[model samples]
Every structure is written in C-alpha cells, then in structure tokens.
Target: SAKDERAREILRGFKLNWMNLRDATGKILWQGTEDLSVPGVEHEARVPKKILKCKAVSRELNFSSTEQMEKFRLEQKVYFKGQCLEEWFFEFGFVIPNSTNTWQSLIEAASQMMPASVLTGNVIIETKFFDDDLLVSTSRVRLFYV
Candidate 1:
C-alpha cells in the first residue's frame, strides 16, 4: 500500500477535475481550466425539457474504408450558444505505436473521451474498454464526469 500512498501524494493539492494533458513526447499541452465558473457561490440548477435544454449528446459514424475515415473530421466549438466554453476535434489517424505498452493506448483513449481534466474532476478514475476495434475507433468521452 505504500506505493499507492505515494501515488496518491501526487494529487494532494491538485483538486478533482484538474488534469495534466501530455503529448507523446511527454510535453504538457494544457491543464484543464480552473475555477472558470462564476464566483464561489454555487448556482441552483433546474432540469430542462428534452428540446429546450441542450441534450447531452454523442454519436459515432463508421466508414467501410479507412481512407474515408481519414478524410473525416468532427468539430465542436460551441454548446448551448456558449462560446469559449469548449472546443474539440476528433478525426481518424492517431497512429497507435507498435510496442508493448497497451496501457498507454488506454490512457490516450481516455483523454480523448474525457477531453479535459476539469470535466474529469471527481474521486474515481473511470475508463471504457471497447468490445471491438470498430467501436474503439469511434469517439469516446471518458465516463467520469461531475
């Protein structure tokens, strides 16, 4: 349990949802946004109707050919008319390396699914392991969310 204790130490001051995004070169691309919401006073929430409220959404499109997949791209620059709230692009061609590190691939997929650390904020680490490559090839958001 000592190793787990040490592992937990890395997150001492780092609040939940805080994330560190590192590229293949191990360079930090971005840290998830911190406290960007309105001042500490939390806001009350209300549920929305299926149409009036933006439905939390997701989709996956598969191609019979990889080339068609390669030419495709998915973009999300706004949600609920909120600008700078989020932006993302998911297309084909994230070359998986030929090596022994399978765990790394899982993390990469998790990052894409999760997008940013802040959205990943929580006490538990969650991931989705697909039953097939065709399904895995599609977009996935990390399952953990506030």
Candidate 2:
C-alpha cells in the first residue's frame, strides 16, 4: 500500500505481465498470464514425498516506457486473499485416505488496522500434504495482478 495519487500513478506504470510457480528443483507447478482475469482455478500436481520448497517467478513489463525495461522477480510466497499472511496448520489424528481422497485448503481474507484500499486482487494459496516425509498431494492457486 502507498500514499498519495503520485505513488498510485507511478505504480500503475508497471503492470503485472505474467507469473508462474515452480518446485524446489525447478519444475513448473503452475503458470498463467494476465488475460485470465478470474482467480479461482485449481492447478493440481502429483508431488513426491519429501521436505521441499518452491519458487514463484513473475515478470512486470514496463508499460510506462518504450524501451526494454522489464523486471524479473523470484520469491517464496504464502499468500492469502492477495494479502501476505503466513500461517500453518497441523494434524496428529489417525487418518487414512482411500483412492477417492484428495488434498484441500481454505483461503480467506485478512486485514489489520488499515484502510480497505490496501487490498488488491484476490487471495492466493499454495498447499501440499505429506504422510511422514512422503508427498501425498500438491496444489497452487495464483493471483496475477497489481
């Protein structure tokens, strides 16, 4: 979030061109462009069992310039509702899954002591489940806008 119309004007100069997500070893988990305006798409993957990490890559092409002045960014994100809120949930109950079971997650909005203008786009989510170091399932939901 920023202040004044000046900052907003400048930020608008750079549009969120495209974005993608990849696993720890550089495997594409999900990818999308700006034209796909709707945010609720389930991109699923068969993840291997292990403690792993992933990278999110995004490119912001400068519409404010006529030259080749785009930017590339790579970072780890645990996004929810277009807001950067990081939280974790764990379970120790005795549970078993059959061929009909699948991994699922809940994404909700979050904001604290701030104006509503700080919110942007939709909430984003990436989740995985493992059974004692074994990857049982993986999925990601990306929000590509600024």
Candidate 3:
C-alpha cells in the first residue's frame, strides 16, 4: 500500500525539536518537539469518522547506553498538541485517539515553534478513515518534532 508505506516512511523521518535536555554524566535525558508529520486516514463503516488529534507538554529523550526507549517509556505527562496526553498507557497498550472527538490540539504551540507565523492557533485534526484500505484523508498536515 503506497499510503501505508508513505506513513511508515514519514514516521521514520519524524523530526524532533529539542526543547530541553537533562545533562548528566551517568544518564542523559532530552525533551523536544515531536516531528510527527501527521498523516491523514479515511473513515469507513468499522471505524466511522477517525481523526488524530494531539496536544503536547514536552518530549523527552535518553541515550541508548544511558537508557533504552522502553526505559523512558515510563509514565509521563506530555502535552501533545494541546491536550495532555499520558504516555503511561501508550506502552501498556493504549492508543491516543484523534481530536476529531473534539476540536482540540496544540496548533498554537506548533506555530510558536515555527520561524514565521502571523498568528498561532489551536492544534486540531480531522481524519476521514477508509476501512477497506485504512486510508485517511486530511487537510492539516504537520509533523510532530520532539
């Protein structure tokens, strides 16, 4: 599936902007912006209207030699876009739903991260999910950088 492939590739290249980092000799941790490069999906009968909404507080990072991805996977409160997204459940088997449930996101914060911005607004996304191919369609396209 070209769309799926594109999504995977985008995820791989997701850009992360360093917002803060903990510098310690024994262990080093980092915080940044999530370069999600958010994609769009289609809505189908099974999924109905699926949207991917997000908020953000901050992004964290750790060195492999210092700590593994799973290690940092520990419970933490991250403001994804605008809503407070708890990553605790993410490792446990919880998937964050699209903000389509409501018009909420951190578009304003995202705009702040941008160099040129006339004004910052909320981060909201509307994804139309296609059940057959699991394809999504959206007008808002931005990457999460952390």
Candidate 4:
C-alpha cells in the first residue's frame, strides 16, 4: 500500500526511473533496459507501464569467499529522473572467504527482494550492525510533494 502510494507521488513530480543489477566484478549481469533473462519476467510490461505515467519502478541472495577472505559488491539500484534525486540501492558486507558465483544467487534475490544500513540491539555503546552471509547494517528514508 505504501509503496503503491510512493509510486503514485514519484509519478507525479520530483521522481525517478529505471533499474539495474551489478555483480561483484563490476559487471552489469542484467539491466532493466538491456538483456532480458529470468523466467516469467516481462521488463517492459512490468516497468514501462509505470514509467509511462514519474516513471515509477523498482534483489539478491547469498554466498561468500573462501580464499584470503575476499570482498566485493553485489548491488541493486534504481535510477531517478528528477532534480535533487539520487540512486537508491542495497549494499551488504557479505561475510565469506570469496565473492564469486554469487551473481546468480544475488540476481535471483534482486528479482525477488532488496537494503542499506544502521545499528541494532541495546548496547552500552552505539555501533553498526555486522552480520554475515545473511543480513547486515541497514538504514531508512521517506517522501512526497505536490
């Protein structure tokens, strides 16, 4: 319901558009505007319908490294099409020895879900969350206007 309203307002003014998926190796494995992989996924019908109207729109899963504890990024982002707007994405501190073979998993998740960061739990001192191979630090935001 809220996301539906969000789509409504963004479609009104001060909005955004498009989306993409990037691998840890800095490659766009799948782009909303480029390749069309995945079963039962109609990019144009699902997204263009919204874009036609502030261009409304909107992944990822698991695995880790096993050698010298390598780390990279598996990011999912939405591009905005207005003034004073920026990318909205999800970045994780995936704990594994290696950061490979996760593109498929991550992409699956992207097609399914998405995050950012903040702290958690009641501690004597404030600190950010550190989780591995599951979930980690996350943040929040909001919007709308006439």
Using TM-score as the measure, which candidate wins?
Answer: 2
lDDT of 1 by residue, 45-144 (tens): 2211221112222322222221111122334332221213345455544322221111121022211222233333221211221212232222222112
Each candidate's root-mean-square deviation in Å? 16.9, 19.0, 16.9, 18.7
- Evaluation by TM-score, superior candidate among 2 and 4: 2
Question: What number of backbone clashes does candidate 1 have, counting pairs of residues 3 or more apart or in separate chains?
Answer: 5
Model 2 per-residue lDDT at 32:
48
Quote model 2's TM-score. 0.30
Please, what is the whole-model Cα lDDT of each candidate in the order they appear? 0.27, 0.33, 0.26, 0.27
Number of the predicted model whose lDDT against the real structure is largest: 2
Off by over 4 Å in 3: 20-146
Q: For all candidates, what are the clash counts?
A: 5, 4, 46, 17
Candidate 4 lDDT over 48-133, as tens digits, reads 11121222222233333332212333222232222222333334433343333323333222221111111111111111222223
User: What digit string (tens of lDDT, one per residue) describes model 3 on residues 29-94?
Assistant: 333343222344321111101112123322232111111111111222333355643323212112
Better of 1 and 2 by lDDT: 2
Error of 1 at 92 (Å): 3.1
Q: Candidates' TM-scores?
A: 0.20, 0.30, 0.19, 0.21
lDDT, candidate 2, equals 0.33
Candidate 1: segments with Cα more than 4 A from true spot: 1-57, 62-71, 79-82, 93-146
Clashing pairs in 1: 17-121, 113-140, 113-141, 113-142, 114-142
